[PDB]
Amino acid sequence: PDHAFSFEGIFGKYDQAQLRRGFQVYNEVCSACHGMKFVPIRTLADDGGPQLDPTFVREYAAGLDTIIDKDSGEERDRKETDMFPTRVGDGMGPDLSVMAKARGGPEYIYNYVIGFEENPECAPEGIDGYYYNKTFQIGGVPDTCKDAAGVKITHGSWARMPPPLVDDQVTYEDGTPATVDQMAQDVSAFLMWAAEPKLVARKQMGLVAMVMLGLLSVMLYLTNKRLWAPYKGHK
Amino acid sequence: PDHAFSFEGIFGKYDQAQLRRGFQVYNEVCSACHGMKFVPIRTLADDGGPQLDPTFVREYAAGLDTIIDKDSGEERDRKETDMFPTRVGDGMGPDLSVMAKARGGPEYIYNYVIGFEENPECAPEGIDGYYYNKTFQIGGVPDTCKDAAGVKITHGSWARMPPPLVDDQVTYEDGTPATVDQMAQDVSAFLMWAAEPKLVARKQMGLVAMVMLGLLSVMLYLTNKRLWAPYKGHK
Amino acid sequence: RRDFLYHATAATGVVVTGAAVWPLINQMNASADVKAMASIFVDVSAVEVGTQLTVKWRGKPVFIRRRDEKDIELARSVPLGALRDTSAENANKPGAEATDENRTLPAFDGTNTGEWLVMLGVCTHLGCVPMGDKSGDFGGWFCPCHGSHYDSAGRIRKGPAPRNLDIPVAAFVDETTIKLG
Amino acid sequence: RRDFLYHATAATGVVVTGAAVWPLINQMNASADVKAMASIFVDVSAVEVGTQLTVKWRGKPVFIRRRDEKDIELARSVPLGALRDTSAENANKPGAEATDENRTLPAFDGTNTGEWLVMLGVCTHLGCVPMGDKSGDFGGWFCPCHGSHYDSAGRIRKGPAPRNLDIPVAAFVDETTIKLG
Amino acid sequence: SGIPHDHYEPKTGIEKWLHDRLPIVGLVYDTIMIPTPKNLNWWWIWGIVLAFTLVLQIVTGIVLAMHYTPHVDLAFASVEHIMRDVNGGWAMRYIHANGASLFFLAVYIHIFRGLYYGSYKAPREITWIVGMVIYLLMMGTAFMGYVLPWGQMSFWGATVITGLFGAIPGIGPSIQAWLLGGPAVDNATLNRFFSLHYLLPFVIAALVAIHIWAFHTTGNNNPTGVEVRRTAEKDTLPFWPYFVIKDLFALALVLLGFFAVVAYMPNYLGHPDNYVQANPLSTPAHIVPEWYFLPFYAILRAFAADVWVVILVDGLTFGIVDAKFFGVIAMFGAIAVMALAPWLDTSKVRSGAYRPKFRMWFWFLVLDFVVLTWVGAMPTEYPYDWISLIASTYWFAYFLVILPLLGATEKPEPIPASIEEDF
Amino acid sequence: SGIPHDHYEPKTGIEKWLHDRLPIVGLVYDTIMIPTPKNLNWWWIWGIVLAFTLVLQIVTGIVLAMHYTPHVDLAFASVEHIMRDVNGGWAMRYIHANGASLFFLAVYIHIFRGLYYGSYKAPREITWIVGMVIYLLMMGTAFMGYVLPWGQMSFWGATVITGLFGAIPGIGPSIQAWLLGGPAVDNATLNRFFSLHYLLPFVIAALVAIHIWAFHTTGNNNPTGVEVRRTAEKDTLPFWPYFVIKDLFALALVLLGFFAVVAYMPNYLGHPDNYVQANPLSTPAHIVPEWYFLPFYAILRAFAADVWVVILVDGLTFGIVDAKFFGVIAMFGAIAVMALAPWLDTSKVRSGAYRPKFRMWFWFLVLDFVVLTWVGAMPTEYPYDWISLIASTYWFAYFLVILPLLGATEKPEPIPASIEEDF
Ligand code: HEC
Ligand code: HEC
Ligand code: HEC
Ligand code: HEC
Ligand code: HEC
Ligand code: HEC
Ligand code: FES
Ligand code: FES
């Protein structure tokens, strides 16, 4: 049905293979236009998410663009301590660091990446340079598709992003059918990581605190029932 | 004698012709190596110092180096709202924004610019690439000039700055003998401006406050003498 | 005297208190690093009338473009009908109709309007910068973020952008300057 | 029982209070954006032994330079006499004499010292960066800020700089790596 | 009567040398063994909740300020530094942000408890005045604080809630500029707000000092229209340990729910648009400032000359009182009248548990509050305009006319004596 | 005796309805009409000076924080933004920076006034304890504050006065890292210090609250070893208006001198090197932290195993108590012993105006303080080492041994009766 993720609930600590797949997808597809400045590269070793091997992290970092410096202007080797690059303009898009919170979030990305079908039977010609999406709601609409008072008759609208993937864009090393849907789910989970890395710690803290406070509250209820006994016994 | 400036005292609001002369020198001599980032270009119209004509300020600004931008990387027109440029390295020196306070201050600059005489009769060969100054005290000294325990026998030391001026380096439009000493005094005053622009306001506030508080204190003394009278009359 | 001395001491205390309080209320006013920003001038100075002129201010661009006759006639030949926003967003005047006579600009301190037009280069849809130099389907400006077609005078057309390009408060400096603010 | 129940409630309250307080004292400790900084590795990986290797760290450069025999012999032929700073600033060991045997570096996890020397590229006079690649009047490093001549092993000579080039705490990672911190 | 029982400092030599600094005398005699009635329901706890929440906010803020950098170019980045690198991070921020919500929720129940059981009625005016002063301070605080992340909603909320001050004539733009540090919003505003936001809580604590001093000198309301009968008072058990423990139990429950929220539903009360950096060139849809200011936002954006009950067309008699100024006055009055209440209710009676008509009107008032909360988020298009106008009109009507009429003809009830209600 | 004269709230209806919140009762009865002796010299003013200076510092700081940006890359720039663009600028900064100097100068005279006229003697111990606590807080505050400009002296002063905590064994480096936010100094330290620096003053005010509560409950010391003779007390005029006006006159004079300084000699008490940005790679000569910490700096850097009176070679018996730790303990003890004084002076007597030997030793102590101040700035080369050692030894000797011996054999003086000294 709704294709719920793993983390959608009181449990679900970010199944990591899914995140490694999303990383294969993000660095080879989405990175061409998008960036994640709010994301340090070293986080690809921190627990909770992709617990990759540090050495591979340093390699992948040195293999990225050149972030010059802060003290002496000079194109450095881009050490992991720096942040992911930033694609800013000239046919590029926003930053995906926290896009999983600026919208139930990841379901938006899934049902957005999912859905770029051809132009409907109201404006088949479409638009030059703009492509159609069935779920983006903040895009333009031709006058042919609007109602009598400016509202659109289409489910979604026209987004400036092209279709990101075809039937079998990339291979998975673990062994898995790399259709469009699985890639969309995986990349959605990866972005949710990039936004909420400390999710599992959140849940564990919540459990511990609920327990301890229920205990404290029960003990206080007993103490209250006791103290207030000689005044609530005859009635 | 000590060649006291105008501002050296309870008065002396920064004789402005001196500062215009110092500006003629700073932009044509010292600016080649030094900078004043901590100084906006729009201060050359604010009262207290050189009350130049704004239009000339905009011209002189546009005639300087190119300060690119903060939002969109692109070499602009170096608008006055920006700050003076910065010469950083490769044969360049520090920033003179507040050098008149990081040392009685301006007298240091005067007696420093003044004094680059030839090497003394202890090390006439000197050093390659370094030149000698009578008053700089934070420079190297050859072993031939040091005493038995590392202390130098010279008045000053060897500074990396070359002699900035000759006998008649520049002309003054107002009409004045532009010898080295007058230029040194003028530029010292200009730097003191660049460091303490709000000097005259300081002095006027001090006067006003001294007066008002002396008045208040006198009135309170009278009130005290009165109240405490019936208890200090028999003795 | 009792009355005089006591009341005078009180008055002096009050005066000193006020002289001490005023700066605590003055420091919050505009510092020097901002007063200059309010008034910004652009020296047109022979911009080769007819192509364009852009300058940064308030963090957004301020478009100063001369007029090309063909652009003008296309402008003056636009009846208010079929005009999305007929309010003449220009804040240098009242809500008068979005007409080219009112919508072009002041007259150099002289008497003429169909020669200069300085507007805020910020698309009213979501704040993108339209491309100039005769573009779009109306011989004006085209917004590449979502496809909004502007006209010669800057009034919005053919797109989601609801209103035209606003016009900040600006007056001339006697035939070679512009005052933005 | 009275005693047991009351005291146990108090104990539980105390435990919960402490579990809530600890993080308010833990957040002030070193955040994630800094823990990584403490440990930095440099992959030597065939630096063409003999010329130089520089890397940024702590905001200052860390010089990792192989040894050239002529540079070595000049080093090992320096008696402690006539040596300004004979303390061997290197913090990976005690204040042992500033000798090349102790002053060069650890031995790759093996047994040899006259082949690598990694010091802090910061002049002890006032913190300038000396120029390397065989410079100065001693076949080592030269500081252009005031003229301080360093030697092959980095010990200060011929200038105001009081002490030699310090040596941070560093150990090897089994023959291809360096650990700085 | 009013037994203080100073303890006479007879314990031992320690309690006798403490005759230098009385402090323990104060605590014991007054702030711990303060006789409180037995008839207290579960509505007299929320003050402890508010005190604890205030302490919590102050602490978490003092911690955050160790990592927040007030500047347009480094605020967002510092907030992310917090939520990612710092050890506890997300906890402090979520506890700070949401705890504000609980704070205001708790003051709402604290206030409406009061309106019911005549806690504003004499002799308890000072407490009411101080409470309204506080409410104002804490509203201003939360406002200054929502700005610091320099998100997108921050900017525009500040923009509008500062254009208010500029609406008024003659001294509007001057105040606007003196408050923003300039013509529009920029780093200067941010610095002001951070400082101010980091200072008012202490003023609030002091005001809470006077708040607590007042209702210790003046007896706690009690469910009925009766006092502790000072003249020995078998009623009025002490505060410690009974009511202390009751309040702590309720507080444990409340914190349990609060942490469950923090850990499962933390971004629920927030606005996602505050997670995108600011663009002074683009405004999002449905700014919707927050949820504890929607009532007054609606009272403001209701009066627009768009109804047959539009009093703006009539107020236009004077050419100075335009619409904007009218709405601003309406909001300031919505609060001033709540403050004036104790001198409007002309009843020699007390808690509405013995005033039926008052019960009905009061529940209508609670409903009006909820409705206003729900309306400030919805557009100004029909029919919501009529709804907002009706609700504001009823608020003002209640607080101005309804209470006098009741005080006149509202005594068909047998008042209870003997605050010792052993039923 | 101790006439409070509550005023009985008999003024009028206003002073009768104020029976809800007592506040004016407190002010009048206690904090204004507090009977103070007639025998007060000009040394009992400096408390008013300290209160006013504290208010001044708090205000000026709240103003500066509207323009200061805590970050390594924008602190210096913000300070210059202040001193140049802002309207008042230089005034606030110079008044903030120098007022700290006056604050400490005034506490020095406040403290030494106390040591003379037995103000630490019973029954005035609590005041002394609270005062030492304050002194500590305000030292830490000024330290945190000297760092914010991110000049050159800031960095290195912080470096050393944090390496202190690291000297101790076992838990030194951990505390150092937990305090600096990392191995060495960087922006994290700056944020901590700014927050902390913007918070402690309020704790100080509260502590000043208790400071004022104490010596109102306990009578003000007086030049004589006598009390106000409570049993009606023709002596002991009230505070208002007499002593209020006297203190305000002295305060006007002091502010006059202070503003003359601010306007003519503002950069005199400062270190020029704090006007050059920081270089973690280069240290200047003669860091010389400040002038209100030189005594303890010298007591610290004196013990170095470089004298025949070097007790470090003897303390080396235990392999853990090295030199550094010894100096740190010596400083902490230099303060702890001053705090312990009231339980070391074994004299059933009072103000040294009737104890000659005490006068001589006390003037020697003042001289020792001045000498320590002058020595912390000069190098550790001969002869200054012997001087510092002698001075520290005398400080400790005074406070440990000298007072007992006096209390034993120090009563060759006729004590004065009748605090009404109509001479
Ligand atoms: C350029 C060829 C792109 C690549 C490849 C990808 N994206 Fe992108 N994206 C691009 C643009 C120009 C825009 C703006 C669209 C607009 O109309 O404004 C976007 C937008 C997105 C968004 C935001 C949608 C929204 O509601 O605002 C998302 C969530 C997004 N894109 C996701 C995404 C992913 C996961 C990609 C890799 C699989 C990817 N995009 C590639 C440009 C380009
Ligand atoms: C390059 C050709 C220079 C020009 C022209 C001027 N200055 Fe300079 N200056 C330069 C250097 C490389 C240095 C550093 C010297 C050193 O040994 O470190 C300086 C230094 C100064 C100083 C600081 C002196 C001190 O005590 O540290 C001052 C006050 C100074 N210079 C003044 C100055 C003036 C007024 C000039 C124009 C008349 C000027 N300098 C020109 C490099 C160069
Ligand atoms: C010691 C400092 C401090 C105190 C005290 C404090 N806060 Fe804050 N507050 C901050 C900081 C820092 C931020 C910005 C970081 C953040 O948003 O969490 C902030 C942000 C906020 C926010 C926005 C939260 C967000 O994430 O957008 C609100 C709402 C708020 N404060 C309300 C309050 C209220 C109400 C009080 C007390 C009455 C209070 N704060 C006390 C420091 C403090
Ligand atoms: C605008 C009104 C208002 C506000 C806001 C308010 N109070 Fe009260 N408070 C009252 C009134 C009325 C009473 C009843 C006093 C009585 O019964 O004598 C009261 C009573 C109390 C009590 C004792 C009885 C009780 O209800 O718990 C406490 C504790 C208390 N308040 C704390 C606080 C704190 C802490 C805050 C804010 C941080 C606060 N209040 C805000 C008006 C207010
Ligand atoms: C509300 C904030 C605030 C308060 C309260 C405050 N200050 Fe500061 N203080 C600052 C700021 C901001 C700076 C940095 C700007 C500056 O140096 O003037 C500073 C800097 C300082 C400095 C260094 C001055 C300089 O220019 O180098 C000292 C010393 C100092 N504080 C001491 C104190 C003491 C002592 C107190 C009270 C006991 C105090 N401050 C109260 C905000 C405050
Ligand atoms: C370490 C000691 C110490 C410090 C520091 C200190 N005090 Fe005092 N203070 C005393 C003592 C002792 C007395 C004498 C009390 C008495 O005579 O009963 C006193 C008395 C006073 C008095 C009343 C008589 C007088 O001397 O003026 C005031 C007012 C006062 N202090 C204010 C302050 C303030 C404000 C501060 C700090 C901001 C401060 N003090 C710091 C110890 C201290
Ligand atoms: S932003 Fe200009 S049209 Fe969408
Ligand atoms: S700084 Fe290296 S020698 Fe002067």
Numbering used by the authors:
A (entry chain D), B (entry chain Q): 5 to 107, 126 to 257
C (entry chain E), D (entry chain R): 11 to 191
E (entry chain C), F (entry chain P): 2 to 232, 237 to 428
Show sentences the authors wrote:
When similar analyses were carried out without imposing C2 symmetry, three distinct maps were obtained for CIII2 (CIII2 c-c, CIII2 b-c, and CIII2 b-b at 3.8, 4.2, and 3.5 Å resolutions, respectively). These maps were superimposable with respect to cyt b and cyt c1 subunits, except for the FeS-ED portions. The CIII2 structures depicted by the CIII2 b-b and CIII2 c-c maps exhibited overall C2 symmetry, but in the former the FeS-EDs were located in b, whereas in the latter in c position. To better define the clusters of cyt domain of cy, the docking analyses were repeated using the three different conformers of native CIII2 (CIII2 b-b, c-c, and b-c). Interestingly, when the FeS-EDs are in c position (CIII2 c-c), the docking models gathered as a single cluster on cyt c1, slightly displaced toward the FeS-ED of the same monomer. Thus native CIII2 is not always a symmetric homodimer, and the FeS-ED of each monomer is free to move independently from the other.
CIII2 is a dimer with each monomer comprised of three subunits: the Rieske FeS (FeS) protein with a [2Fe-2S] cluster, cyt b with hemes bH and bL, and cyt c1 with heme c1 cofactors. The FeS protein external domain (FeS-ED) is mobile between the b (close to heme bL) and c (close to heme c1) positions. In R. capsulatus, both the diffusible cyt c2 and the membrane-anchored cyt cy carry electrons from CIII2 to CIV in respiration. Here we report the cryo-electron microscopic (cryo-EM) structure of this functional bc1-cbb3-type SC (CIII2CIV, at 5.2 Å resolution), together with three structural conformers of native CIII2 (at 3.3–4.2 Å resolution).
